[PDB]
């Protein structure tokens, strides 16, 4: 039940990087 939150982090990871 986390895929719905990771399906974006993998595309916005640069937000923190």
Short mmCIF file of N, CA and C in Angstrom, two decimals:
data_model
loop_
_atom_site.label_atom_id
_atom_site.label_comp_id
_atom_site.label_asym_id
_atom_site.label_seq_id
_atom_site.Cartn_x
_atom_site.Cartn_y
_atom_site.Cartn_z
N UNK A 1 0.83 -1.20 0.00
CA UNK A 1 0.00 0.00 0.00
C UNK A 1 0.87 1.26 0.00
N UNK A 2 2.08 1.13 -0.53
CA UNK A 2 3.00 2.26 -0.59
C UNK A 2 3.34 2.61 -2.04
N UNK A 3 3.00 1.71 -2.95
CA UNK A 3 3.27 1.92 -4.37
C UNK A 3 2.61 3.21 -4.86
N UNK A 4 1.51 3.59 -4.21
CA UNK A 4 0.79 4.80 -4.58
C UNK A 4 1.55 6.05 -4.15
N UNK A 5 2.56 5.85 -3.31
CA UNK A 5 3.37 6.96 -2.82
C UNK A 5 4.77 6.93 -3.42
N UNK A 6 5.14 5.77 -3.96
CA UNK A 6 6.46 5.60 -4.57
C UNK A 6 6.39 5.84 -6.08
N UNK A 7 5.19 5.73 -6.64
CA UNK A 7 4.99 5.93 -8.07
C UNK A 7 5.27 7.38 -8.46
N UNK A 8 5.56 8.21 -7.46
CA UNK A 8 5.85 9.62 -7.70
C UNK A 8 7.25 9.98 -7.21
N UNK A 9 7.63 9.43 -6.06
CA UNK A 9 8.94 9.69 -5.49
C UNK A 9 10.05 9.32 -6.47
N UNK A 10 9.80 8.30 -7.29
CA UNK A 10 10.78 7.85 -8.27
C UNK A 10 10.86 8.82 -9.44
N UNK A 11 9.93 9.77 -9.49
CA UNK A 11 9.89 10.76 -10.56
C UNK A 11 10.18 12.15 -10.02
N UNK A 12 10.06 12.31 -8.70
CA UNK A 12 10.30 13.59 -8.06
C UNK A 12 11.44 13.49 -7.04
N UNK A 13 12.18 12.39 -7.11
CA UNK A 13 13.30 12.17 -6.19
C UNK A 13 14.29 13.32 -6.25
N UNK A 14 14.36 13.98 -7.40
CA UNK A 14 15.26 15.11 -7.58
C UNK A 14 14.86 16.28 -6.69
N UNK A 15 13.67 16.20 -6.11
CA UNK A 15 13.17 17.25 -5.23
C UNK A 15 14.06 17.40 -4.01
N UNK A 16 14.64 16.29 -3.56
CA UNK A 16 15.52 16.31 -2.39
C UNK A 16 16.97 16.15 -2.81
N UNK A 17 17.19 15.52 -3.96
CA UNK A 17 18.54 15.31 -4.47
C UNK A 17 19.11 16.60 -5.05
#
